[PDB]
Amino acid sequence: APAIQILNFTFDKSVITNGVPSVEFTVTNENDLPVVGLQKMRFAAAQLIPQGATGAGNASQWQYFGDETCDVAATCPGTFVDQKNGHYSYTFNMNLTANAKITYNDQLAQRVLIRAYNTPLPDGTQVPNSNAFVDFTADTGAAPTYSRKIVATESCNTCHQDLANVKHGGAYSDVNYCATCHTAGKVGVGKEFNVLVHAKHKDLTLGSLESCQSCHAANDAAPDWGNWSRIPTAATCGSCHSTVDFAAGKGHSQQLDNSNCIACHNSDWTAELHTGKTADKKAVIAQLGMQATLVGQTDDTAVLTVSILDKDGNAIDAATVQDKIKRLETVTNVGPNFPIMGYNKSPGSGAAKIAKDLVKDGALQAGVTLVDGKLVFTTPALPFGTGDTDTAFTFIGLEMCSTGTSLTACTVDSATTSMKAELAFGTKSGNAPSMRHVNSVNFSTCQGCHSDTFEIHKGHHSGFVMTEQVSHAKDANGKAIVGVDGCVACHTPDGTYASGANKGAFEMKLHVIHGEQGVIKECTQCHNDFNLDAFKVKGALATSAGKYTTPITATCTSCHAPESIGHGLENMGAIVNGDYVQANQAAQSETCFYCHKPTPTDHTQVKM
Amino acid sequence: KGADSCLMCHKKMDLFKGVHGAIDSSKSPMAGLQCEACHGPLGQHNKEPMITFGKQSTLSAEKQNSVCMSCHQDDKRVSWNGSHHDNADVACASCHQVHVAKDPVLSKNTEMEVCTSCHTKQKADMNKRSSHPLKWAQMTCSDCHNPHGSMTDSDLNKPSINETCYSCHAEKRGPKLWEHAPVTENCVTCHNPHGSVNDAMLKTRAPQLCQQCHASDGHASNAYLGNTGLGSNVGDNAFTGGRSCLNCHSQVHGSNHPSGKLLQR
Amino acid sequence: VETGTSGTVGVGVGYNSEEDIRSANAFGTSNEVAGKLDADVTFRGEKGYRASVEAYQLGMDGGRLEVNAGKQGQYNVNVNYRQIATYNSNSALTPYSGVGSDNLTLPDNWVTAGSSSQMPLLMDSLNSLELSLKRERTGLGFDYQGESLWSTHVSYMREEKTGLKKASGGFFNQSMMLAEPVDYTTDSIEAGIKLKGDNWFTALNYNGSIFKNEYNQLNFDSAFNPTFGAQTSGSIALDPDNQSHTVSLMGQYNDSTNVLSARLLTGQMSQDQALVTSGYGYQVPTEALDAKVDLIGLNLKVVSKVTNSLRLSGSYDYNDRDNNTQIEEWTQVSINNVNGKVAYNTPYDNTSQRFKVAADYRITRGMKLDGGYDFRRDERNYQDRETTDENTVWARFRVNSFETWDMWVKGSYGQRDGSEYQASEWTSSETNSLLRKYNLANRDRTQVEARVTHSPIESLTIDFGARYALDDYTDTVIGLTESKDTSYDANISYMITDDLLANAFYNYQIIESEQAGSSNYSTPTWTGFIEDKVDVVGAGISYNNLLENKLRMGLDYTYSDSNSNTQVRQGITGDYGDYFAKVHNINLYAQYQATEKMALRFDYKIENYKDNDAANDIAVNGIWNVVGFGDNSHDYTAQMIMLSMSYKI
Ligand code: HEC
Ligand code: HEC
Ligand code: HEC
Ligand code: HEC
Ligand code: HEC
Ligand code: HEC
Ligand code: HEC
Ligand code: HEC
Ligand code: HEC
Ligand code: HEC
Ligand code: HEC
Ligand code: HEC
Ligand SMILES: [Ca+2]
Ligand SMILES: [Ca+2]
Ligand SMILES: [Ca+2]
Ligand SMILES: [Ca+2]
């Protein structure tokens, strides 16, 4: 019954006899038990040209001989042998000396690949699509002198989760397999891997791709990972630098081949100019922190005190860097588990969020003062209430003028950097503050795609770098959780400035934005859990201008067109785009989770 | 006195048309002991110790050099007494001969044929592809060596290997602003002074020579496989073809250019 | 005549074709037809006045002349002349004009391009040039001997060197082969005072050298489009006018039991040439250098006879050069930095001191044994290793007595080690931590040589020997790893007392070097195998016809095969192509003593020469980023003759 999860391969003997390849291997499952009865497999053979053999400055390059698919129940060109103990062997039909395109060379390091199809065993057990490969010397079958193992599947999976998702119907899950097939002669010019992948990511904004280390880092499965700086060539550099024609001498001096590139473009130069902008960024972000406190008053106002911190976290006299602050931006709301102040004025409370910049262009703004070296500002009165609305909260973003790794006095022409954001809580009663959940979405998942220096909303705003500076909770292993709970100070249930038109409420915003991105394919990419109980303190959410929807329905229709739900929604005590009072009367009358039992791993699950 | 008579018994042949048959100066025959000095008649032969039978050739006695040494220790025959020749039981007579006009060894057309009789290695070396022009006697071993031995290691006429090269290659004497360390230290860290298969008398040439000392990351430390069958011809690149590394680093013997540190200009 | 002018003078003329100028080395000159003027004449008869002039092959290369005069035993004044000339090629092609000049220019109609394959006017423009170097040394000397002890020496020669060298000027990777002009004039001066005694003598010598290059920089237009930096013309700094001066005091104490030799030496080499600023857009810290290097030497040798069975010797030598040129900040050009990379000059200092001791024990006349130990220590500046120390122990054993055989064999084993190896900070890019520059690395050099000569019959003799050396760098993991040299040789001579003499030789040598390197600036990934080998054979016949019209003639044959083969292995193995020189030399000579007061001789030599460098077998536009000189290969058969005549006068 226990359908096979993992196929793990061990190669015992691998060679070429008079030009015919032969492999003998062992297969075992996730608990190291032999796997017997394998039905369908594709076998591929290849050859590695070393650095320089094609020309000085040229990189190492595979030659793809070809593939054969063996089905035990049907055709199989070669000789497939099951020792019915976990051990197997295959002998190819092809003879490499007979290849029309490639002169087989007994001395080149050889490689043989296996795609194990998803065909189930004769006894009915499921087999997962798998892939394995081996590197061997043609005659002796031993480890070769040289290799081309540059990038590792782990690095791609940071964003793609499983490389199979990407192309060719899931047939291929290990980047070495792609790297071997995508070589000169096998695929078209321009689709070689050292050019194809760069070209498919160059025009993407993802922050992690701003540095070569998102794909080119030290890793045990990549002994050649450092080639990323040592093998400059026209094809691979030009894959990102498409404006240059080296042969013509347009945009660069003429380069009729790659003999000379390495002479000018030494490893250290290539490396710094492509990693330096990220390093500078981290270097400047690291210099200042922020801690804020927020105190409720008897007159329903709130005193916000902001404290700028040094590299080690000790407070500093803020006037010492006032001249370097481009914008210190605050946003204050009430009710962290469900903000009751809209971006504009809310239909209920009638209040709009409190948006105040503490510093603009080096200058303290109206109503802000310096006390013990700290910034202080007192809000207009806020709609304090009972329970959750006993807690007011404020989100703080800092944008500093900079140069390189330096903070500099701000000028008209000045570069900026968004610094570590801060989150602060305070109450009117003086009792302990309520706080929103962080246990369903960890900011760490984003870092994979967006980098640890995601300057969110840099541009029209100060920008927000989410760090443990905002953390107020820890996980199972005891590590600090960075949540995105601060964002709801603007992304309120009542939307942002269009009050529903852009579906601003945070419960929906990221979903709409990212449902339209083909890289996003599983809820596990942000979600470690769904906190469904949270809906129990939710009201209705604005889904178009001025009209509201019960929260579960609102969340699902971020991706699911309301009309496309066959079974209908008003049936379920739902209200979809009704007026405020109607919708929030029905906020807790939704029937969805009586049926729908979603997990991040499969959200379509149901119990009737 | 004089003893003018040893001559008439002997076949009136050994013409004394040469320097030691001359008469004017106070050395050798006149105002001196004539055929006594080199042979020795207290009581002349036809008479071993204190006797007049000095052999003087390749034949009988050895360590007979004593006699010509009483007369010839100038600045050049110093270090002779422990010289590789003296300790090899080589004699002033095996090289020089007095009893004919002008000595062959001091023709420079011939000083090779005499030296190569024992030093057979050099007779290979100056037939090699490159070497100093000794074959047709534009030069000989006296130009570099002193056969009587010097205080320098291979009996070179100058006090060190580099100042013996500078006597003819003064262009290369220091001090330059940016000098290549091996060149300054010892010229035969790269060159073979007798000859070589490779041009310019190099022990090794083109890129591999430099790659023995230069191992920095990049183009100095890559494998230049040359002719490969898989695409890389040997003369299709500036690293193995042409002058190899010297197409871009031509000043291999040093530079006096403000920007010459990489031996470029 | 014993008194008065006496001797012989002669002349000669010779012809040669073809015009490939390597033939000019075997021949006297380059010209189609040669000129010669030999001489040897002597005067005496004026109270000891003597006045000889001798002249070898004057009128062509190798030419020499020496005239002397004065009183036989008081003084002598001589004047000399020597000519050397080596010819390299006349097959090279360059688009540059002003060849042999300070300034190499392209036509004003020239069209730059990004590579030689794409320069439209390159082929059309190529003019032929001749690579060759010629030396003309004229000297003059006074020599005054004293009555008793003191004699003095003073001499002065001036060499004028002219011709053309191969040079490369480019901008970063764009490169042009340029005709570097050479118009050198180097003066030498010697002056010495010697005091000589019964069993001692002291000398005081002054030697001086003065190099003067006519041209001090080489300017050239760029055949290429301007690359980064935006230059149309370069300026190479040529060899600067320099000079060197030195005085050595020497002392010898002779004695039947012991002898002591000493040499003291002090000198200074100077260079004050103004610096090149053309084509250089940064500020020099000085308009001119004042580089000085100070030399000091000390030499000590004692050789004593402890008994007559054995002789013991010791030596000590010390040679220290201290460059105290003045350090400054020099702006280097850099492709990575537009404002230049600043570098300090590193004036290298070199000290050497050696200590050695030996022993020559004659067990028996005809059988001598010799044994010695040598220590050397060299200290250095600004480099991977501070100090290197070698201990070598050696011996030699000669055996002449038994039969007509005469044998001897010698063996030496030396270990070089030194201080901590750690790469310099003074390079622009730090070397691999595993690299060992071979002149600094720990080495074990062991060489053994044996030679035998046997002559059973008289009128024949056969000598043969064998040599083997091995430099093994044990702790070198990147760099030169091992170099082994093995030689054989066999020479034979004989005659049936026929009064024609014959000989034959064959010598063979191979030098096998083996190195490693690392593409990923770590542990090795490739290895290089170089094989530098030579075979040379020859035989000659010579017949002196005695008791007749004093004829004498001879025939000589020699063939050499110099050959290099290098191989690199990284993953696979590649090799460099043909690198060889194969040459046949035959020399046929014959002289007839016709007319008693005259004699005539006739020479005829054929030279079949063929050389090929696979790297330079390409055309001018053969490599895209370089402008070459073209194919350098030679294959020619040269037919040369000469007549000569000598009349007694
Ligand atoms: C053969 C064994 C393959 C391996 C494994 C993978 N790919 Fe592939 N792919 C292959 C071919 C012949 C082609 C056609 C292109 C051509 O003209 O020959 C492709 C195509 C792609 C493309 C798009 C190409 C385009 O024309 O723009 C992509 C993006 C691509 N392949 C990616 C990819 C990935 C991610 C791989 C493994 C994870 C992979 N390929 C394996 C052949 C083979
Ligand atoms: C994933 C999106 C990558 C990004 C980001 C960068 N590179 Fe890359 N590179 C990538 C792949 C999948 C490969 C081919 C691996 C193979 O086995 O064929 C490469 C290859 C290179 C190379 C070639 C090295 C060689 O041929 O030996 C270079 C020089 C290279 N990449 C450079 C480079 C730089 C400088 C990067 C950031 C600026 C960079 N790559 C990003 C995948 C990805
Ligand atoms: C006001 C001070 C804001 C805070 C704090 C945050 N966001 Fe925002 N966001 C804001 C506005 C006015 C808008 C445009 C209108 C709209 O609702 O879309 C946005 C938009 C986004 C989007 C959409 C994509 C885009 O247009 O770039 C995303 C994905 C988004 N916001 C996310 C986001 C997050 C993650 C924040 C805190 C971690 C956050 N916003 C804070 C206003 C404000
Ligand atoms: C980021 C790239 C997202 C991925 C992909 C998906 N979700 Fe999400 N979700 C995201 C955010 C930032 C939040 C709001 C957190 C808050 O404090 O308000 C949510 C919320 C939900 C919820 C509500 C439950 C909760 O944990 O708060 C649900 C029920 C939900 N998301 C469902 C869901 C599904 C089914 C997804 C894939 C099919 C999915 N989300 C992807 C961010 C992201
Ligand atoms: C006859 C009365 C002689 C007188 C007077 C001198 N020499 Fe002589 N000598 C004589 C003969 C017949 C020979 C030939 C010996 C032979 O074996 O044929 C010699 C030989 C010499 C030699 C050569 C020795 C050798 O190699 O065999 C020398 C160097 C020599 N003689 C010197 C010499 C001197 C210096 C004399 C006067 C001081 C003198 N000889 C007188 C016969 C006679
Ligand atoms: C070859 C094995 C030699 C032996 C042994 C000795 N001499 Fe020599 N000598 C030899 C050469 C090739 C020359 C050429 C001049 C030069 O530039 O080296 C000389 C020269 C002399 C001279 C002339 C002045 C001089 O060159 O110093 C003298 C006075 C002289 N030689 C004496 C001499 C003595 C005393 C020897 C043995 C103890 C001796 N020579 C041996 C070659 C060889
Ligand atoms: C290697 C590190 C070397 C040292 C030490 C010395 N020289 Fe050199 N020399 C070297 C090379 C690679 C070449 C080839 C030049 C070419 O055009 O291919 C040469 C050549 C010479 C020459 C001929 C050309 C020249 O530039 O003059 C001479 C006359 C020469 N070398 C002399 C020389 C002297 C005098 C040195 C120390 C005193 C010396 N070389 C050291 C490499 C190296
Ligand atoms: C042009 C086609 C070149 C040839 C051929 C070689 N080198 Fe080179 N080299 C070249 C440039 C443009 C540079 C850098 C210029 C700058 O301003 O940075 C260099 C630099 C070096 C260095 C210093 C840098 C380093 O890697 O340490 C060395 C030690 C060096 N070059 C050595 C070297 C060797 C050993 C060569 C053949 C084996 C060689 N270069 C060829 C341009 C060119
Ligand atoms: C993938 C994207 C690559 C590829 C594979 C390479 N480059 Fe290269 N490069 C890339 C970017 C996004 C930038 C801009 C970086 C910045 O300025 O912040 C650069 C920049 C350069 C530069 C700077 C010159 C300039 O535009 O001011 C150079 C010299 C450069 N990149 C060189 C280079 C070489 C030699 C490469 C192949 C080894 C190479 N790039 C690849 C993006 C990418
Ligand atoms: C000699 C100098 C060369 C060598 C032979 C090559 N390059 Fe390359 N390169 C060089 C410089 C001085 C610059 C400008 C750097 C800057 O502006 O800071 C460049 C630039 C590039 C770029 C960047 C494209 C851009 O300007 O946006 C690339 C991609 C590049 N160089 C690559 C490259 C290749 C592939 C080479 C040989 C195959 C090569 N260069 C040779 C200097 C030199
Ligand atoms: C100083 C040097 C002298 C002097 C002043 C004389 N000899 Fe005589 N001798 C000398 C040498 C170096 C040699 C061997 C090498 C050579 O011949 O050049 C000899 C040998 C002879 C011989 C052997 C036969 C021959 O010469 O071929 C004879 C016969 C001989 N020596 C005799 C001789 C006479 C008669 C002398 C004064 C009139 C005389 N020598 C002087 C070295 C020197
Ligand atoms: C034996 C030791 C060698 C060999 C055979 C060559 N070089 Fe060099 N070289 C050597 C030293 C000790 C140094 C000083 C720097 C160091 O300690 O490594 C150098 C320096 C250079 C430089 C300057 C580079 C810099 O400053 O970083 C260049 C450009 C250079 N050498 C070139 C070069 C070439 C072309 C060689 C063979 C033709 C070559 N070297 C051989 C020591 C040694
Ligand atoms: Ca905090
Ligand atoms: Ca909205
Ligand atoms: Ca001058
Ligand atoms: Ca010093």
Residue numbers in the entry:
A (entry chain C): 43 to 650
B (entry chain A): 62 to 73, 78 to 112, 116 to 333
C (entry chain B): 47 to 695
From the paper:
Here, we report the atomic structure of an outer membrane spanning protein complex, MtrAB, that is representative of a protein family known to transport electrons between the interior and exterior environments of phylogenetically and metabolically diverse microorganisms. MtrAB is proposed to span the outer membrane and provide electrical connection between the catabolic electron transfer network within the cell, and the electron dispersing MtrC outside the cell (Edwards et al., 2018). Within this complex, the ten heme MtrC is the cell-surface module required when solid-phase minerals serve as terminal electron acceptors (Coursolle and Gralnick, 2010, Hartshorne et al., 2007). The Gram-negative Shewanella is one of the most studied bacterial genera capable of transferring electrons out of the cell to solid-phase Fe(III) and Mn(IV) minerals in order to support anaerobic respiration (Beblawy et al., 2018, Edwards et al., 2018).
The Mtr complex from Shewanella baltica OS185 produced crystals that diffracted to a final resolution of 2.7 Å, and data were phased utilizing the anomalous signal from the 20 iron atoms of the c-type hemes. The crystal structure reveals a heterotrimeric complex that consists of two cytochromes, MtrC and MtrA, and a beta-barrel protein, MtrB, that sheathes and insulates MtrA. A network of 20 bis-His coordinated hemes spans the complex, forming an electron transfer pathway of 185 Å. Hemes A1 to A10 of MtrA are arranged such that neighboring pairs have alternating parallel and perpendicular porphyrin ring planes for which the closest edge-edge distances lie between 3.9 and 6.5 Å. Solubility of the Mtr complex in the lipidic outer membrane is conferred by MtrB, a hydrophobic barrel comprised of 26 antiparallel β strands. The interactions between MtrB and MtrA allow MtrA to be positioned across the outer membrane while insulating the MtrA hemes from the outer membrane environment, preventing non-specific reduction of membrane soluble exogenous molecules such as oxygen, which could result in the generation of reactive oxygen species that in turn lead to cellular damage (e.g., lipid peroxidation). The pore is of sufficient size to allow folded MtrA (∼80 × 30 × 35 Å) to insert into the periplasmic opening of MtrB but prevents MtrA from escaping to the cell exterior, effectively trapping it inside MtrB. At the cell surface, the surface loops of MtrB largely cover MtrA so that only MtrA residues 284 to 306 and heme A10 are presented for interaction with MtrC. Interprotein electron transfer from heme A10 is facilitated by the positioning of MtrC heme C5 within an edge-edge distance of 8 Å. In the Mtr complex, MtrC is angled on the surface of MtrAB so that the more insulated side of MtrC faces the membrane surface, while the negatively charged heme propionates face toward the environment thereby providing a suitable surface for direct electron transfer to large extracellular substrates.
